[PDB]
Chain length 271, copies 2
């Protein structure tokens, strides 16, 4: 009983969102908004045909789609320069949305959405499991400052990982180690990379989007590793879908809180 509009359906991420939402039984409206260049084009995805509209009378077009689909939630994976415009558009129409798009005037974004009093999930990281790992490290560092005093950190991050703004995420993880007492990045190219585990070489699969955080004790007798590898965009699509389902529950319940993030989603549980 939920329908979504995927703004940015012509991109790799919009496509992945469509697939995931479809697997979860979410209805996909055959309509979208895009740039002037994309206006008029149809997007063939997952058996769906989506008609991309340009900016001519957007507000009115979005409204009519919203009147036909009162259960609508917009998913926004667009471009930095559309973030504020699109949030204002969603605001004027009153339609709830989930925005994974990075960049834009982020302060203006939060201002707009709070002012317009609509329901939204805003999260620059939609890989919910990565967010959960980050939140664990934030909590550990908050509870136990200095627990790793003296340990040395090496951090590795692949090219694909860097680009899909997880340097935001990597930076926040590093802050957690610092607060844990570490004094402290290798951007990596090869599909494998080596570290020293108790004086012994260890080869790590560093293809696709890869992050490795390696801690070593002063006397080199203790090694800790935290690693993740992500291929494609499934994790981000699945988390985006989780945010849609979360936001639908909040709308249905008429919750006082309006603007939400991936921590909020994670606390609700699996849906």
């Amino acid at each position: 009983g939920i329908s979504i509009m995927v703004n940015g359906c012509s991109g790799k991420m919009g496509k992945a969102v469509i697939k995931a939402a479809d697997s979860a039984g979410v209805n996909i409206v055959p309509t979208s908004f895009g740039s002037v260049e994309e206006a008029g084009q149809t997007v063939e995805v997952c058996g769906k045909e989506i008609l991309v509209h340009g900016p001519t009378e957007r507000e009115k077009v979005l409204s009519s789609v919203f009147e036909k689909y009162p259960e609508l939630i917009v998913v926004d994976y667009t471009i930095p320069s559309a973030v504020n415009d699109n949030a204002e558009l969603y605001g004027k129409v009153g339609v709830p949305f989930v925005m994974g798009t990075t960049g834009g005037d982020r302060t203006r974004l939060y201002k707009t959405v709070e002012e317009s009093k609509i329901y939204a999930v805003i999260s620059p990281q939609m890989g919910k499991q990565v967010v959960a790992f980050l939140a664990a490290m934030e909590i550990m560092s908050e509870q136990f400052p200095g627990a790793f005093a003296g340990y040395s950190l090496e951090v590795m991050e692949s090219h694909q990982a860097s680009k899909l703004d997880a340097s935001g995420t990597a930076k926040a993880v590093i802050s957690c180690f610092q607060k844990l007492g570490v004094s402290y990045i290798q951007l990596i190219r090869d599909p494998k990379q080596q570290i020293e585990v108790v004086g012994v070489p260890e080869e790590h699969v560093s293809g696709h989007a890869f992050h490795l955080y390696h801690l070593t004790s002063p006397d080199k007798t203790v090694s800790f590793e935290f690693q993740h590898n992500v291929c494609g965009r499934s994790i981000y699509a699945e988390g985006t879908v989780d945010a849609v389902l979360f936001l639908a529950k909040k709308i249905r319940s008429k919750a006082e809180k309006r603007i939400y993030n991936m921590i909020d989603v994670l606390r609700e549980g699996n849906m």
Copy 2:
């Protein structure tokens, strides 16, 4: 200004504690308690000569050492069958202690120590950084139940890791993944072991005490790893020393709370 008695100084762990405590400038009393077999023997360690006493009039001997060293804290790394006896001995004398010894009647242990109203740190895991990792996972699982619903877990654990009762620790970590929505151990022999990271073999250094927790998404596009390797007993010695320093601060401050664990130590910070 702190002195310690190392009960179990003839073992590998007592020796490591002595080294660590000495590096931290903690004074080491030239006196200890041991079994009948060890009675009379001198233990040469770290330049120190420690005289091991058997059980003949223990209570009186320990008392005289305590009168000569009012700042004393006993470190207990003995054997399961001495845990309760020794705790009762420390209780009768009134001497504070830090016990890393595993096994014994653990319920009786807590009962005794609470009744005798002495200061103590009791912790079956003294590897403080491992405890911090466990506590992070406990918190993540507590905050975000179901965050990894559907992911599959493989857990590997080496022989040395299993024996130094970190199966307690591994079990508790696994509970955290279950609460995170996972449905769910390979005891490993070889110095290297393979896992599948996005359809690609990854060789892991699995010598000494090794733990690997590997999570995979249903579609196999997401891999997470948490690993630690420990060589020797330095980590446990260093954590034991941290508990001594923690307990000294509590005694000096005259704290109402009497019986403490490694979470308490971790929250205090680096000392």
